[PDB]
Amino acid sequence: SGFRKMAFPSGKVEGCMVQVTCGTTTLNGLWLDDVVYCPRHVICTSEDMLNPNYEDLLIRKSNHNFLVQAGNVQLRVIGHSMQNCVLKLKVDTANPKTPKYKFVRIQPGQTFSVLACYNGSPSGVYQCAMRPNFTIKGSFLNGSCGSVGFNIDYDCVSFCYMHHMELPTGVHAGTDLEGNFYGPFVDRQTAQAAGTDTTITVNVLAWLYAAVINGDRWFLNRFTTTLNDFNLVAMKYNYEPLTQDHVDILGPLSAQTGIAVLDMCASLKELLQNGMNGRTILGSALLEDEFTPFDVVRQCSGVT
Numbered sequence: 372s373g374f375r376k377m378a379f380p381s382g383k384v385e386g387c388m389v390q391v392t393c394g395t396t397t398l399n400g401l402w403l404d405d406v407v408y409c410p411r412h413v414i415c416t417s418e419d420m421l422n423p424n425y426e427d428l429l430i431r432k433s434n435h436n437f438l439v440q441a442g443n444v445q446l447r448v449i450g451h452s453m454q455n456c457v458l459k460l461k462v463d464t465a466n467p468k469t470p471k472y473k474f475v476r477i478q479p480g481q482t483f484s485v486l487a488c489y490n491g492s493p494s495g496v497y498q499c500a501m502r503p504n505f506t507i508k509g510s511f512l513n514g515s516c517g518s519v520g521f522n523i524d525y526d527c528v529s530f531c532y533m534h535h536m537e538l539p540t541g542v543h544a545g546t547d548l549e550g551n552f553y554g555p556f557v558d559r560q561t562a563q564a565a566g567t568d569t570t571i572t573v574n575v576l577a578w579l580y581a582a583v584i585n586g587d588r589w590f591l592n593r594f595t596t597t598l599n600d601f602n603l604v605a606m607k608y609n610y611e612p613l614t615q616d617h618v619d620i621l622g623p624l625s626a627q628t629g630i631a632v633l634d635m636c637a638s639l640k641e642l643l644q645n646g647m648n649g650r651t652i653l654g655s656a657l658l659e660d661e662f663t664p665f666d667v668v669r670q671c672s673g674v675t
């Protein structure tokens with residue numbers, strides 16, 4: 372029993388984190404095969420960061436202006452290119468600890484593990500979700516830039532997130548590993564708004580299923596609801612509207628608990644209109660949307 376916000380084991384990723392230095396700016400990079408990936412803002416100085424011309428800035432730099440250290444091993448940089456918002460640095464040595472990996476652009480509502488790094492050294496690992504407005508509510512200080520988000524599928528590391536910046540509101544923005552931002556953000560020091568955050572309804576339902584599985588059944592009621600009626604309520608409360616695909620993804624939890632999705636929905640609707648009244652569910656006084664139906668199954672079936 373139990374239910375925890377579990378992160379994936381970080382071993383496979385620990386051995387790919389390096390430090391990258393360009394003049395006086397230092398941040399994290401990811402060393403896979405013989406390419407180092409990092410945020411292109413490493414070539415910026417203090418002055419450049421309000422309105423940087425990344426083309427003009429990168430033209431002043433040669434291979435030897437870049438210092439890549441992995442522990443006390445200094446890697447020789449022999450090639451450099453900019454792919455959107457990442458630098459790719461061609462180094463002379465292929466990382467001997469390169470796992471099986473792929474690069475994946477994830478969707479809002481999906482979860483991943485973050486390995487927070489300073490100067491190429493891991494400090495901690497946490498699980499979070501890509502919010503519907505393409506931000507993450509991370510825990511990152513200065514120098515965390517280049518920390519990555521990842522999923523593990525058996526032996527295969529899927530890289531989905533590189534950390535680039537903090538918004539003046541305290542939340543976090545970054546790219547996939549092809550250097551495309553999640554959301555409408557730019558890598559310059561100007562004020563930018565994320566739009567409305569919403570709650571990931573399919574994730575809240577998945578956690579309601581986790582709760583029932585672990586003995587917390589008080590919020591289960593007699594009532595039921597239609598999808599259209601459930602959705603009219605969800606929108607009032609800034610919840611994501613639920614489609615047939617969502618119903619399809621929850622089928623296994625529906626099957627395991629013997630509780631129809633639309634009956635679980637009816638239970639959720641009542642919590643929205645009545646609140647928790649001081650009660651908790653898996654020890655939380657709020658509705659949790661940072662577990663996916665997959666996470667819940669994986670955690671409650673002991674997948675390695």
Ligand SMILES: *CCC(=O)N(c1cc(C(C)(C)C)on1)[C@H](C(=O)Nc1ccc(OC)cc1C)c1cccnc1
Binds near residue numbers: 420512538
């Ligand atoms: C790794 C660098 C760093 O810590 N950092 C950063 C990013 C940039 C850009 C990409 C050149 C804007 O400059 N510094 C971020 C960060 O985004 N800092 C920052 C920039 C701008 C504003 O308001 C306009 C506010 C903040 C906090 C960073 C990342 C994580 C934690 N602290 C800072």
